[PDB]
């Protein structure tokens, strides 16, 4: 009825209506960072998603 | 690897997965149960950094 990954987590599931196996992937997660020239110089900044 | 396996430990809480508790129990009972998992998880995290 279920699958589980080696991270102990429920990776996949059987649909009760269609008995079709479905794989889950979490909502996208992102690492965020900010770059600056130094406040005593300029305020334009660039952003980086890791 | 050890740190990921530590997510499955229940620390004497009702269940390993918080969503099980936070579904089946109302706030004033969950809030004395989820309180334990946090203490158990933090201490496993603290050890890793050290």
């Amino acid at each position: 009825q279920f699958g589980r990954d080696i991270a102990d987590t429920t990776d996949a599931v059987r649909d009760p209506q269609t008995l079709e196996i479905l794989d889950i992937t979490p909502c996208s997660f992102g690492g965020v960072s900010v770059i600056t020239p130094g406040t005593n110089t300029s305020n334009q900044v660039a952003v980086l998603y890791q | 690897n050890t740190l990921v396996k530590q997510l499955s430990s229940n620390f004497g809480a009702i269940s390993s997965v918080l969503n099980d508790i936070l579904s089946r129990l109302d706030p004033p009972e969950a809030e004395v149960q989820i309180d334990r998992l946090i203490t158990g998880r933090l201490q496993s995290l603290q050890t890793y950094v050290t």
């Binding site: 991270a7 987590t9 979490p26 997660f29 690492g31 890791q50 | 740190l3 990921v4 997510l7």
Partner: peptide, 24 residues
């Protein structure tokens, strides 16, 4: 293709979670 040296390219091959907030 890599400028890696002949001994270095021999050397490399002797050697060999994101959902949980672990990252590299």
């Amino acid at each position: 293709p890599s400028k890696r040296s002949f001994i270095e390219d021999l050397l490399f091959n002797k050697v060999t979670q994101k959902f949980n907030g672990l990252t590299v």
